[PDB]
Short mmCIF file of N, CA and C and ligand atoms in Angstrom, two decimals:
data_model
loop_
_atom_site.label_atom_id
_atom_site.label_comp_id
_atom_site.label_asym_id
_atom_site.label_seq_id
_atom_site.Cartn_x
_atom_site.Cartn_y
_atom_site.Cartn_z
N UNK A 1 0.62 -0.97 0.00
CA UNK A 1 0.09 -0.05 0.04
C UNK A 1 1.19 1.05 0.17
N UNK A 2 0.53 2.25 -0.71
CA UNK A 2 1.29 3.65 -0.78
C UNK A 2 0.41 4.55 -0.07
N UNK A 3 0.71 4.92 1.24
CA UNK A 3 0.19 5.88 1.81
C UNK A 3 -0.04 7.24 1.23
N UNK A 4 -0.86 7.96 1.39
CA UNK A 4 -0.99 9.57 1.35
C UNK A 4 -0.27 10.24 2.61
N UNK A 5 0.41 11.26 2.62
CA UNK A 5 0.81 11.84 3.71
C UNK A 5 0.03 12.13 4.94
N UNK A 6 -1.10 12.73 4.97
CA UNK A 6 -2.04 12.89 6.08
C UNK A 6 -2.65 11.71 6.34
N UNK A 7 -3.01 10.66 5.36
CA UNK A 7 -3.50 9.30 5.76
C UNK A 7 -2.34 8.67 6.54
N UNK A 8 -1.36 8.59 6.23
CA UNK A 8 -0.20 7.80 7.32
C UNK A 8 0.01 8.56 8.49
N UNK A 9 -0.33 9.82 8.50
CA UNK A 9 -0.18 10.55 9.92
C UNK A 9 -1.38 10.37 10.93
N UNK A 10 -2.54 9.99 10.26
CA UNK A 10 -3.76 9.62 10.99
C UNK A 10 -3.59 8.33 11.44
N UNK A 11 -2.90 7.28 10.53
CA UNK A 11 -2.91 5.76 11.00
C UNK A 11 -1.56 5.72 12.04
N UNK A 12 -0.56 6.42 11.98
CA UNK A 12 0.47 6.34 12.83
C UNK A 12 -0.13 7.09 14.17
N UNK A 13 -0.79 8.17 14.31
CA UNK A 13 -1.53 8.44 15.49
C UNK A 13 -2.25 7.72 16.10
N UNK A 14 -3.32 6.93 15.50
CA UNK A 14 -4.03 5.73 15.70
C UNK A 14 -3.16 4.72 16.50
N UNK A 15 -1.90 4.37 15.68
CA UNK A 15 -1.45 3.14 16.27
C UNK A 15 -0.31 3.75 17.35
N UNK A 16 -0.27 4.85 17.84
CA UNK A 16 0.39 5.26 19.09
C UNK A 16 1.63 5.82 18.89
N UNK A 17 1.99 6.20 17.57
CA UNK A 17 3.25 6.97 17.49
C UNK A 17 3.53 8.30 18.03
N UNK A 18 2.55 9.32 17.97
CA UNK A 18 2.54 10.68 18.26
C UNK A 18 3.10 10.77 19.80
N UNK A 19 4.38 11.42 19.68
CA UNK A 19 5.19 11.69 20.80
C UNK A 19 5.53 10.22 21.49
N UNK A 20 5.65 9.23 20.76
CA UNK A 20 6.31 7.98 21.46
C UNK A 20 7.82 8.25 21.44
N UNK A 21 8.13 7.74 22.80
CA UNK A 21 9.55 8.36 23.02
C UNK A 21 10.19 9.58 23.01
N UNK A 22 9.05 10.58 23.03
CA UNK A 22 9.32 11.86 22.70
C UNK A 22 9.39 12.55 21.35
N UNK A 23 9.22 11.50 20.45
CA UNK A 23 9.21 12.05 19.13
C UNK A 23 7.93 12.14 18.44
N UNK A 24 7.60 13.52 18.25
CA UNK A 24 6.40 14.07 17.59
C UNK A 24 6.09 13.30 16.28
N UNK A 25 4.72 13.30 15.84
CA UNK A 25 4.17 12.55 14.77
C UNK A 25 4.87 12.78 13.49
N UNK A 26 5.11 14.31 13.12
CA UNK A 26 5.83 14.63 12.08
C UNK A 26 7.23 14.00 11.77
N UNK A 27 8.06 13.44 12.89
CA UNK A 27 9.39 12.87 12.77
C UNK A 27 9.11 11.37 12.27
N UNK A 28 7.98 10.80 12.44
CA UNK A 28 7.39 9.48 12.08
C UNK A 28 7.11 9.54 10.60
N UNK A 29 6.46 10.56 10.34
CA UNK A 29 5.80 10.75 8.69
C UNK A 29 7.21 10.99 7.98
N UNK A 30 7.90 11.97 8.41
CA UNK A 30 9.07 12.50 7.62
C UNK A 30 9.97 11.19 7.16
N UNK A 31 10.14 10.34 8.49
CA UNK A 31 11.19 9.16 8.31
C UNK A 31 10.54 8.26 7.29
N UNK A 32 9.21 7.87 7.47
CA UNK A 32 8.62 7.03 6.44
C UNK A 32 8.79 7.73 4.85
N UNK A 33 8.51 8.84 4.91
CA UNK A 33 8.63 9.51 3.56
C UNK A 33 9.93 9.30 2.84
N UNK A 34 10.98 9.45 3.46
CA UNK A 34 12.40 9.22 3.18
C UNK A 34 13.00 7.96 3.24
N UNK A 35 12.33 6.94 3.91
CA UNK A 35 12.82 5.72 4.02
C UNK A 35 12.32 4.92 2.94
N UNK A 36 10.85 5.16 2.52
CA UNK A 36 10.05 4.30 1.77
C UNK A 36 9.29 5.16 0.68
N UNK A 37 9.30 6.33 0.69
CA UNK A 37 8.16 6.96 -0.11
C UNK A 37 6.86 6.73 0.25
N UNK A 38 6.54 6.24 1.42
CA UNK A 38 5.09 5.86 1.97
C UNK A 38 4.44 4.55 1.50
N UNK A 39 5.51 3.72 1.05
CA UNK A 39 5.18 2.39 0.29
C UNK A 39 5.52 1.35 1.36
N UNK A 40 4.34 0.51 1.85
CA UNK A 40 4.75 -0.49 2.68
C UNK A 40 5.31 -1.82 2.22
N UNK A 41 5.48 -1.67 0.92
CA UNK A 41 6.28 -3.00 0.25
C UNK A 41 7.49 -2.65 -0.18
N UNK A 42 8.06 -1.41 0.23
CA UNK A 42 9.48 -1.07 -0.25
C UNK A 42 10.31 -2.26 0.55
N UNK A 43 11.21 -2.46 -0.43
CA UNK A 43 12.58 -3.39 0.27
C UNK A 43 13.86 -2.89 -0.21
N UNK A 44 14.81 -2.96 0.41
CA UNK A 44 16.40 -2.56 -0.02
C UNK A 44 17.34 -3.70 0.52
N UNK A 45 17.92 -4.49 -0.29
CA UNK A 45 19.16 -5.21 -0.07
C UNK A 45 20.33 -4.51 0.29
N UNK A 46 20.82 -4.71 1.57
CA UNK A 46 22.13 -3.96 1.69
C UNK A 46 23.48 -4.67 1.49
N UNK A 47 24.54 -4.12 1.24
CA UNK A 47 25.80 -4.53 0.93
C UNK A 47 26.03 -5.85 1.70
N UNK A 48 25.73 -5.95 3.26
CA UNK A 48 25.99 -7.06 4.24
C UNK A 48 25.01 -8.24 4.07
N UNK A 49 24.15 -8.13 3.09
CA UNK A 49 23.24 -9.39 2.86
C UNK A 49 21.86 -9.13 3.41
N UNK A 50 21.77 -8.31 4.49
CA UNK A 50 20.52 -7.76 5.15
C UNK A 50 19.84 -7.13 4.24
N UNK A 51 18.55 -7.12 4.44
CA UNK A 51 17.42 -6.32 3.75
C UNK A 51 16.64 -5.68 4.83
N UNK A 52 16.27 -4.20 4.23
CA UNK A 52 15.45 -3.45 4.96
C UNK A 52 13.94 -3.52 4.25
N UNK A 53 12.88 -3.62 5.30
CA UNK A 53 11.49 -3.94 4.91
C UNK A 53 10.44 -2.76 5.19
N UNK A 54 9.80 -2.55 4.40
CA UNK A 54 8.66 -1.65 4.63
C UNK A 54 8.67 -0.53 4.84
N UNK A 55 7.55 0.39 5.32
CA UNK A 55 7.35 1.71 5.29
C UNK A 55 8.56 2.55 5.97
N UNK A 56 9.12 1.73 7.11
CA UNK A 56 10.08 2.36 7.95
C UNK A 56 11.63 1.60 7.72
N UNK A 57 11.37 0.66 6.51
CA UNK A 57 12.85 0.23 6.23
C UNK A 57 13.46 -0.72 7.52
N UNK A 58 12.86 -1.41 8.08
CA UNK A 58 13.35 -2.10 9.25
C UNK A 58 14.35 -3.18 8.89
N UNK A 59 15.43 -3.48 9.13
CA UNK A 59 16.44 -4.37 8.92
C UNK A 59 16.41 -5.55 9.49
N UNK A 60 16.77 -6.89 8.73
CA UNK A 60 16.80 -8.11 9.05
C UNK A 60 18.19 -8.53 9.87
N UNK A 61 18.97 -7.67 10.05
CA UNK A 61 20.38 -8.04 10.90
C UNK A 61 19.83 -8.01 12.31
N UNK A 62 18.97 -7.46 12.73
CA UNK A 62 18.71 -7.10 14.28
C UNK A 62 17.03 -7.53 14.41
N UNK A 63 16.44 -7.07 13.39
CA UNK A 63 14.81 -6.80 13.98
C UNK A 63 13.82 -7.65 13.47
N UNK A 64 14.28 -8.55 12.39
CA UNK A 64 13.17 -9.47 11.77
C UNK A 64 13.85 -10.74 11.43
N UNK A 65 13.07 -12.04 11.18
CA UNK A 65 13.75 -13.06 10.50
C UNK A 65 13.27 -13.04 8.90
N UNK A 66 14.05 -13.28 8.02
CA UNK A 66 13.81 -13.35 6.62
C UNK A 66 14.66 -14.58 6.12
N UNK A 67 15.10 -15.44 6.99
CA UNK A 67 15.65 -16.81 6.52
C UNK A 67 16.88 -16.68 5.68
N UNK A 68 17.48 -15.40 5.22
CA UNK A 68 18.66 -15.25 4.51
C UNK A 68 19.36 -14.29 4.93
N UNK A 69 19.48 -14.07 6.29
CA UNK A 69 20.35 -12.79 6.98
C UNK A 69 21.11 -13.77 7.83
N UNK A 70 22.19 -14.69 7.79
CA UNK A 70 22.90 -15.71 8.85
C UNK A 70 23.59 -14.99 9.72
N UNK A 71 23.35 -15.42 10.89
CA UNK A 71 23.81 -15.00 12.32
C UNK A 71 23.39 -13.77 12.70
N UNK A 72 22.14 -13.49 12.29
CA UNK A 72 21.29 -12.09 12.75
C UNK A 72 20.38 -12.47 13.72
N UNK A 73 19.69 -11.35 14.22
CA UNK A 73 18.90 -11.46 15.31
C UNK A 73 17.26 -11.10 14.91
N UNK A 74 16.39 -11.37 15.53
CA UNK A 74 14.96 -11.07 15.31
C UNK A 74 14.37 -10.56 16.68
N UNK A 75 14.60 -9.43 16.87
CA UNK A 75 14.44 -8.72 18.37
C UNK A 75 13.03 -8.33 18.32
N UNK A 76 12.32 -8.11 17.14
CA UNK A 76 10.80 -7.93 16.94
C UNK A 76 9.87 -9.13 16.88
N UNK A 77 10.80 -10.31 16.95
CA UNK A 77 10.10 -11.51 16.91
C UNK A 77 8.82 -11.74 15.96
N UNK A 78 9.43 -11.34 14.78
CA UNK A 78 8.54 -11.26 13.41
C UNK A 78 9.17 -11.84 12.27
N UNK A 79 8.61 -12.42 11.24
CA UNK A 79 9.11 -12.66 9.85
C UNK A 79 9.10 -11.12 9.33
N UNK A 80 10.10 -10.91 8.62
CA UNK A 80 10.27 -9.62 8.01
C UNK A 80 9.20 -9.35 7.17
N UNK A 81 8.55 -10.08 6.42
CA UNK A 81 7.43 -10.29 5.52
C UNK A 81 6.28 -9.40 6.23
N UNK A 82 6.10 -9.33 7.80
CA UNK A 82 5.02 -8.80 8.26
C UNK A 82 5.11 -7.37 8.26
N UNK A 83 6.51 -6.76 7.92
CA UNK A 83 6.62 -5.46 7.66
C UNK A 83 6.10 -4.86 6.35
N UNK A 84 5.77 -5.74 5.43
CA UNK A 84 5.32 -5.19 4.15
C UNK A 84 3.68 -4.97 3.96
N UNK A 85 2.74 -5.36 5.14
CA UNK A 85 1.63 -5.56 4.97
C UNK A 85 0.93 -4.05 4.73
N UNK A 86 -0.31 -3.80 4.36
CA UNK A 86 -0.85 -2.70 4.28
C UNK A 86 -1.23 -2.24 5.51
N UNK A 87 -1.41 -3.25 6.47
CA UNK A 87 -1.59 -3.15 7.96
C UNK A 87 -0.33 -2.72 8.62
N UNK A 88 -0.31 -1.58 9.07
CA UNK A 88 1.09 -1.08 9.65
C UNK A 88 1.48 -1.51 10.97
N UNK A 89 0.61 -2.37 11.74
CA UNK A 89 0.76 -2.92 13.04
C UNK A 89 1.98 -3.26 13.33
N UNK A 90 2.67 -4.29 12.63
CA UNK A 90 4.03 -4.72 12.83
C UNK A 90 5.04 -3.78 12.49
N UNK A 91 5.00 -2.98 11.52
CA UNK A 91 6.16 -2.02 11.44
C UNK A 91 6.16 -0.94 12.65
N UNK A 92 5.08 -0.43 13.09
CA UNK A 92 4.84 0.29 14.25
C UNK A 92 5.28 -0.14 15.52
N UNK A 93 4.91 -1.32 15.93
CA UNK A 93 5.06 -2.08 16.89
C UNK A 93 6.67 -2.29 17.05
N UNK A 94 7.30 -2.63 16.07
CA UNK A 94 8.79 -2.93 15.88
C UNK A 94 9.45 -1.69 15.85
N UNK A 95 9.04 -0.70 15.26
CA UNK A 95 9.72 0.72 15.42
C UNK A 95 9.68 1.39 16.74
N UNK A 96 8.52 1.01 17.53
CA UNK A 96 8.55 1.23 18.84
C UNK A 96 9.81 0.69 19.69
N UNK A 97 9.99 -0.58 19.44
CA UNK A 97 11.04 -1.29 19.94
C UNK A 97 12.54 -0.54 19.65
N UNK A 98 12.49 -0.19 18.48
CA UNK A 98 14.00 -0.06 17.67
C UNK A 98 14.05 1.47 18.64
N UNK A 99 12.99 2.45 18.53
CA UNK A 99 13.28 3.76 19.15
C UNK A 99 13.40 3.84 20.58
N UNK A 100 13.23 2.86 21.14
CA UNK A 100 13.31 2.60 22.78
C UNK A 100 14.95 2.07 23.03
N UNK A 101 15.66 1.67 22.16
CA UNK A 101 17.00 1.21 22.14
C UNK A 101 18.08 2.93 22.29
N UNK A 102 19.23 2.50 22.71
CA UNK A 102 20.01 3.78 22.91
C UNK A 102 20.13 4.91 22.05
N UNK A 103 19.97 4.67 20.81
CA UNK A 103 19.90 5.76 19.78
C UNK A 103 18.64 6.46 19.33
N UNK A 104 17.44 6.08 19.82
CA UNK A 104 16.38 6.58 19.45
C UNK A 104 16.32 6.66 17.84
N UNK A 105 15.58 7.66 17.24
CA UNK A 105 15.42 7.66 15.75
C UNK A 105 16.70 7.79 14.83
N UNK A 106 17.70 7.98 15.44
CA UNK A 106 19.18 8.22 14.89
C UNK A 106 19.31 6.53 14.18
N UNK A 107 18.61 5.69 14.66
CA UNK A 107 18.46 4.28 14.04
C UNK A 107 18.13 4.38 12.36
N UNK A 108 17.27 5.07 12.15
CA UNK A 108 17.01 5.66 10.75
C UNK A 108 17.81 6.54 10.15
N UNK A 109 18.57 6.12 8.99
CA UNK A 109 19.54 7.09 8.25
C UNK A 109 18.90 8.02 7.73
N UNK A 110 17.68 7.76 6.99
CA UNK A 110 16.95 8.88 6.31
C UNK A 110 16.33 9.79 7.06
N UNK A 111 16.16 9.20 8.51
CA UNK A 111 15.33 10.32 9.54
C UNK A 111 16.74 11.34 9.84
N UNK A 112 17.94 10.91 10.23
CA UNK A 112 19.24 11.30 10.57
C UNK A 112 19.46 12.39 9.69
N UNK A 113 19.39 12.12 8.35
CA UNK A 113 19.93 12.82 7.16
C UNK A 113 18.87 13.92 6.74
N UNK A 114 17.55 13.61 6.76
CA UNK A 114 16.61 14.38 6.09
C UNK A 114 15.44 14.89 6.77
N UNK A 115 15.50 14.51 8.06
CA UNK A 115 14.30 14.98 8.98
C UNK A 115 14.93 15.71 10.30
N UNK A 116 15.86 15.25 11.06
CA UNK A 116 16.40 15.61 11.98
C UNK A 116 16.91 17.04 11.91
N UNK A 117 16.45 17.87 13.00
CA UNK A 117 16.72 19.22 12.74
C UNK A 117 16.28 20.36 11.87
N UNK A 118 15.35 19.56 11.36
CA UNK A 118 14.24 20.26 10.46
C UNK A 118 12.73 20.54 10.87
N UNK A 119 12.21 21.39 10.38
CA UNK A 119 10.62 21.56 10.46
C UNK A 119 9.85 20.30 10.28
N UNK A 120 9.96 19.31 11.38
CA UNK A 120 9.27 17.97 11.06
C UNK A 120 7.80 18.20 10.97
N UNK A 121 7.01 19.17 11.90
CA UNK A 121 5.75 19.39 11.92
C UNK A 121 5.05 19.55 10.73
N UNK A 122 5.85 20.24 9.62
CA UNK A 122 5.30 20.54 8.41
C UNK A 122 4.76 19.10 7.51
N UNK A 123 5.18 18.06 8.05
CA UNK A 123 4.72 16.74 7.40
C UNK A 123 3.43 16.57 7.94
N UNK A 124 3.01 16.95 9.10
CA UNK A 124 1.54 16.68 9.40
C UNK A 124 0.48 18.20 9.21
N UNK A 125 1.28 19.05 8.65
CA UNK A 125 0.51 20.41 8.64
C UNK A 125 -0.77 20.46 7.99
N UNK A 126 -2.02 20.72 8.12
CA UNK A 126 -3.05 20.79 7.24
C UNK A 126 -3.92 19.62 7.72
N UNK A 127 -3.45 18.36 8.06
CA UNK A 127 -4.07 16.95 8.20
C UNK A 127 -4.82 17.29 9.48
N UNK A 128 -5.98 16.54 9.26
CA UNK A 128 -7.24 16.49 10.29
C UNK A 128 -6.51 15.21 11.19
N UNK A 129 -6.36 15.45 12.41
CA UNK A 129 -5.81 14.43 13.41
C UNK A 129 -6.45 14.73 14.86
NA1 NA B 201 17.19 -11.45 11.53
#
């Protein structure tokens, strides 16, 4: 599924990301825009053989099992395929575990490089929430 900006803002708010670990909703919408262009089916194969999955491009080295990332972890206790659903539950619940570890939203390269230190609330402005 390819979300609209305000559509994803509403869904992420309903799924409890607004101010999760102190990160305003605009941070999460900005991260999804630059990680996946709001496409839940986005995948990216990394140099190290791990893969990034879904609207927040969550990586198989740590967070999910894809059966092809040897010696990796599955800290979200999910198949990586769960991160590609039109239903953002698995992506949101896994993102909540990720952002609760030491480095917060710095875990997302696109957030660090394209959202952090910017007017992120612009991403939810005009939206009915
Ligand atoms: Na894994």
